[PDB]
From Swiss-Prot:
Any single Gene Ontology cellular-component annotation: extracellular region
Origin organism lineage: Eukaryota, Metazoa, Spiralia, Lophotrochozoa, Mollusca
Cysteine pairings via disulfide bonds: 2-16, 6-18, 12-23
Family: Belongs to the conotoxin P superfamily.
Function (record text): Neurotoxin. In vivo, elicits 'spasmodic' symptomatology.
Domains: entry comment: The cysteine framework is IX (C-C-C-C-C-C).
Tissue specificity statement from the Swiss-Prot or TrEMBL entry: Expressed by the venom duct.
Keywords of this entry: Amidation, Cleavage on pair of basic residues, Disulfide bond, Neurotoxin, Secreted, Signal, Toxin
Protein's name according to its UniProt entry: Conotoxin Gm9.1
GO molecular function, one term: toxin activity
């Protein structure tokens, strides 16, 4: 779903959590 770096939903999108390890997806999606 979201495979990009970010700190505060700066690069993330579509309700994608952002952390030190970049953005995250749901249900293990691309």
């Amino acid at each position: 779903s979201c495979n990009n770096s970010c700190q505060s939903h700066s690069d993330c999108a579509s309700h994608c959590i952002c952390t030190f390890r970049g953005c995250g997806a749901v249900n293990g999606l691309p």
